[PDB]
Amino acid sequence: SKYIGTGHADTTKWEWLVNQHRDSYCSYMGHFDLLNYFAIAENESKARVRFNLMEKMLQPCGPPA
Amino acid sequence: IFCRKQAGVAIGRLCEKCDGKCVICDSYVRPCTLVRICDECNYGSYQGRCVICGGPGVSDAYYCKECTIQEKDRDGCPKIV
Amino acid sequence: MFLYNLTLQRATGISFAIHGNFSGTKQQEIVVSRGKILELLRPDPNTGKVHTLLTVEVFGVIRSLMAFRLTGGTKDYIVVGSDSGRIVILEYQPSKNMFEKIHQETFGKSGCRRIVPGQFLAVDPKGRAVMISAIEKQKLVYILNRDAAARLTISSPLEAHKANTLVYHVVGVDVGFENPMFACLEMDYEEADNDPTGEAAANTQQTLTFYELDLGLNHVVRKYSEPLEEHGNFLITVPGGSDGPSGVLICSENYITYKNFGDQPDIRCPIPRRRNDLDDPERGMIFVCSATHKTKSMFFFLAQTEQGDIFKITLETDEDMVTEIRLKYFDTVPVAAAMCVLKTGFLFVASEFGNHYLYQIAHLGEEPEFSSAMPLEEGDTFFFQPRPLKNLVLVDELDSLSPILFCQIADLANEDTPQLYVACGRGPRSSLRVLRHGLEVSEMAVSELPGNPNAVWTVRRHIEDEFDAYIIVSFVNATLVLSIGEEVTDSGFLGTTPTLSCSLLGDDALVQVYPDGIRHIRADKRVNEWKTPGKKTIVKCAVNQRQVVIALTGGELVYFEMDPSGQLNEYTERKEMSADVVCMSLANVPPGEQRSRFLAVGLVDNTVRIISLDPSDCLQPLSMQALPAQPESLCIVEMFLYLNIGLQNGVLLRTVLDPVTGDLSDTRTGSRPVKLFRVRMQGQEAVLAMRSWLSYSYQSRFHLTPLSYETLEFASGFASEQCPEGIVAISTNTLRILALEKLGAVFNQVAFPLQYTPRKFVIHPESNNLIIIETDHNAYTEATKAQRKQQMAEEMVEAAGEDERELAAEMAAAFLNENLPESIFGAPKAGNGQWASVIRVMNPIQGNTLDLVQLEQNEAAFSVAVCRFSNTGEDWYVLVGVAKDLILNPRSVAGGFVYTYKLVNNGEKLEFLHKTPVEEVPAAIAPFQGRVLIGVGKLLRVYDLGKKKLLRKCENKHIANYISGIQTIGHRVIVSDVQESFIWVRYKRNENQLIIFADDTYPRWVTTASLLDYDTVAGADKFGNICVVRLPPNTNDEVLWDRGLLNGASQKAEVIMNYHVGETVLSLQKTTLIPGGSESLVYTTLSGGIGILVPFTSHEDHDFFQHVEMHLRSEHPPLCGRDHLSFRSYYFPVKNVIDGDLCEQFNSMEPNKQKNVSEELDRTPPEVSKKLEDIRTRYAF
Ligand SMILES: [Zn+2]
Ligand SMILES: [Zn+2]
Secondary structure, three states, X not given: OOOEOEOOOOXXXXXXXXXXXXXXXXXXXXXXXXXHHHHHHHOOOHHHHHHHHHHHOOOOOOOOO | XXXXXXXXXXXXXXXXXXXXXXXXXXXXXXXXXXXXXXXXXXXXXXOOEEOOOOOEOOEEOEEEHHHHHOOHHHOXXXXXX | OOEEEEXXXXXXOOOEEEEEOOXXXXXXXXXXXOOOEEEEEEEEOOOOEEEEEEEEEOOOOEEEEEXXXXXXXXXXXXXXXXXXXXXXXXXXXXXXXXXXXXXXXXXXXXXXXXXXXXXXXXXXXXXXXXXXXXXXOOEEEEEEEEOOOOOXXXXXXXXXXXXXXXXXXXEEEXXXXXXXXXXXXXXXXXXXXXXXOOHHHHHOOOEEEEEEXXXXXXXXXXXXXXXXXXXXXXXXXXXXXXXXXXXXXXXXXXXXXXXXXXOOOOEEEEOOEEOOOOOOOOOOOOEEEEEEEEXXXXXXXXXXXXXXXXXXXXXXXXXXXXXXXXXXXXXXXXXXXXXXXXXXXXXXXXXXXXXXEEEEEOOOOOOOXXXXXXXXXXXXXXXXXXXXXXXXEEEEEEOOOOOOOXXXXXXXXXXXXXXXXXXXXXXXXXXXXXXXXXXXXXXXXXXXXXXXXXXXXXXXXXXXXXXXXXXXXXXXXXXXXXXXXXXXXXXXXXXXXXXXXXXXXXXXXXXXXXXXXXXXXXXOOOEEEEEOOOOOOEEEEEEEOOEEEEEEXXXXXXXXXXXXXXXXXXXXXXXXXXXXXXXXXXXXXXXXXXXXXXXXEEEOOOEEEEEEOOOOOOOOEEEEEEOOOOEEEEEEEEOOEEEEXXXXXXXXXXXXOOOOOOOEEEEEOOOOOOOEEEEEEOOEEEEEEOOXXXXXXXXXXXXXXXXXXXXXXXXXXXXXXXXXXXXXXXXXXXXXXXXXXXXXXXXXXXXXXXXXXXXEEEEOOOOOOEEEEEEEEXXXXXXXXXXXXXXXXXXXXXXXXXXXXXXXXXXXXXXXXOOXXXXXXXXXXXXXXXXXXXXXXXXXXXXXXXXXXXXXXXXEEXXXXXXXXXXXXXXXXXXXXXXXXOEOOOOEOOOEEEEXXXXXXXXXXXXXXXXXXXXXXXXXXXXXXOEEEEEEOOEEEEEEOOOOOOEEEXXXXXXXXXXXXXXXXXXXXXXXXXXXXXXXXXEEOOOOEEEEEEEOOOOEXXXXXXXXXXXXXXXXEOOOEEXXXXXXXXXXXXXXXXXXXXXXXXXXXXXXXXXXXXXXXXXXXXXXXXXXXXXXXEEEEOOOOEEEEEEOOOHHHHHHHHHHXXXXXXXXXXXXXXXXXXXXXXXXXXXXXXXXXXXXXXXXXXXXXXXXHHHHOOOOHHHHHHHHHHHHHHOOO
């Protein structure tokens, strides 16, 4: 309940997925190789990949329903 | 009810009756990770008191191997209050 | 069944780099993170060259690093943020050569978690506090101080948490001796989660927030916060106190801004852009990294843009206030993960990918200097011209394999030892690199000898000489005396007769040994001579800087020692051996001793025997050993004393030397009688055995690595003006002077440049040529780059109306002819969804391009195969799978194509045959039973060749998601799904059907797959794991009412192995890395790491390394505080793998801990080290 990320009976689809996406982007920012993978695939600088991920943290799934 | 605040540099203690016991799960088996407590729990009159029951404290409190494996040592100050 | 993991080549990529006096001595060092590994580097300011002092596997993810220093201290600490939930402080200890963990403060649960601190790490510039923070919510502040014993002490954490708040970056603010302050780029997402219109999300401003730690009230206050006009990606600490105006520099898209609290106005400067930039005009520009350089008088920042261009940034001040930022273009270098300025005037550049660089800073910056104070129009920009290096001089390049995208172990060069063919790099810094086990040899001089040469020796003229003075050469019937450049007869009074040895007899003297006798030569013109008594002759000899021993016909041994005046004196005692002497060796004397103790003598007896030459026990035997065969040769050496033995057979031997010889080890080393010689390497004594091999020590370990060079027959050490440390060697007539380029590296690499990121390659079987497909997103083809440049030139002229058109035409003509190399200046970034791709046929022996096909703009090659088709029999065809107009995020594609070429002219040319359209990306192509399988998105198809198109002959529609790869044995097909891991498909010929018969029970994000056997697959995934999946016995492959099991296939593969490697693995290959060695599973990582997994052969071995791993997990815990078992169990519980990288930590431990652990194992430490070496030497060096 106090831990951000935990759910309960009234958790919506949107809330759960926004958790998955914010949690994924944090994993990407930490796992240097997974970040390497994305930077090479996009043909982009690591710094820009991190910046793009931070930008995506704000509203990763589009607006709430 | 555990305090669950940020663990400090202060080390948890156990009274004679509650010794050997893991704070989180009462096991007498394989003490492993040294217990840390929040400053407020170590403060003043509370200096050196038992984490489990508030007794005079004679020994260092530990999380057992299972609690260590489960990262239950990470939840924060385990003084029962 | 049971596997052991070993790293061969450690990760070469760098994620973090920090500066300090980690030794505490005035010399500056670099600590670098390689993600999974911490490493300390010393750049030598004399040579301008980088040495690795220390490497440690930390068995966790280093997420951040800082250096810090306590006020009044002299040594820098490393503070590490990691996926361990604990802030760790390390001190480097030069004496022990190790990182010592000073503190480990625990605060949370492990893993790279969103709300647990570890990502960002910031220090008070005066060392008094460190903040460690997460991406969301939690920030913790630890106060640092020293005790009465001057040991570092750390407080309880003070929290500074804030709900719903993202952190982009944090830095400490230099405030002098005022209360420590941390600046955070923060954004609050609360409103964005509450507004269904999306208005709030777009109206959300990132803020700069300053947290003050009150040392006197022991809490953290969020003292100031202010919104920013545009989002910053990172912060730079500006020097304060008496060193500057403090504050912070926010780097943001297209801008750099200076902010400070108080009456300071915001100063903002746009980032200058390259004149006539071919990039997409819609792309904004960020700084990607920065370095700060401080000096008594002044400071400046270097900040690098995405394009690789470095700007020198400086601040102009009036009183305390900054008044303007001034940017000057500095130089362009590859895009950097980190830049660090050494006080000695060097710039280290840890490249994002590829090799790293050390540059000497030749100048500190006619070039125009841009400023915030300059008037600039709305939507306008400053412009600068990129050019070649002007302030920086390259002094060292650190060869790194990151990223490895495709590797293939094969003997394409016919060397009877396969080479690792690796497709590395990214963009225009891509390469194919051929890796070969051994040291890199350089010829410093070359010559040829007449007739039949048989031996060679090297000598000084005085012990004080910086270099040798003579080379003595031998032939079956003669000898020859040469200079260190040419025959020299100045002080060379050498005999013409065949020779056993030539050497330095004493401080100013030389000796020659021949079957008749011994000739003594002085530097001054005086010759003394000795002859063999009776009818006997000399057969073998041994020497030291003040002593001689000889072995005669019948095995009689005779000894001589130098008296103070400088003359040999024959000893009174003579001893005969039990058998004929085959070889001898004598230890080199310590510099504070007149004589050397230990003689070794090898016999036809198949024994080696140790004798003293000391007058207390002269010619007395000390100890002896029996051997597998007759010796060829011997050599005693220190690093600590060892005897080395070469046999007439190709099996080498090492034993520790004492009055009783201790433990020993042996290895195949080859077939020819093993000949041993002394050499000098990195200033140390070492031995050369002859593949040729150097035996030496590095990182407290011992190495026997071959030389990647020709067959050599005799050799000796060398020092000269032409070659300061090296070898004189002979191969047949060849007379070469040879030098060794590197000590610690296990592979030497040749690099063949490529144009775009190589996605995959295959080897044409009948010619060994590589068909490489290279592909970049955000990229122009050559054709498109030309067209874009033409229209830019036309537009540049059309922009002018007056007589300025003459100048505009000149500028346009210049621009059309300027050709800044992509490998230096970066390939121009085309927009999103833009692709450039080529198919290249290159010879692997030397990387000449035999053919180059360029694909159309926005065609991206993703798969390639080489095969025959049964309908045509003999011809070879290259099939390349291409996506058209693929958009990565969000995923969308305009279909794809499979291009078919026939490969002609003995594998040298691609004759285009036809292009076949497909509905989705043909992501995998696999030759199969004289046809080809193609994975077209989620569809698996069998295609035959036809004439005008490939012809679909079978299809399966039941794979879950996108097919990422295909492998086959017999009638079996193994499909990698992008997420749903492995699906087993059987092709049935008569029915003409592809039937799914088994699948995995776990999601795996498969990146690569290797078939181990007919029932077993090794997989890698995107999350740094390896697994092995096996079909359980009696799995049947001969197969609305059907539902299957758990919404998948009726039969399930069983995971028999799980292991978190720590790095993303893009290749796996079952192969033997050494001739006559055992087979292993080689894997390559994105970070440029190479390792193996190898099966244990038996219970006893398995059980032993399991017990070693269990004891090391507890007694030698991972440096940065992560549980080893938890790390290896990152995504799935570790199963049937022992970490040999943990086991080999045994050799790094303090000897008391080695004793404790070996006692627990019922062994002694030498036996443990022997077992560690024995496994790592059976499967791969
Ligand atoms: Zn108690
Ligand atoms: Zn417990």
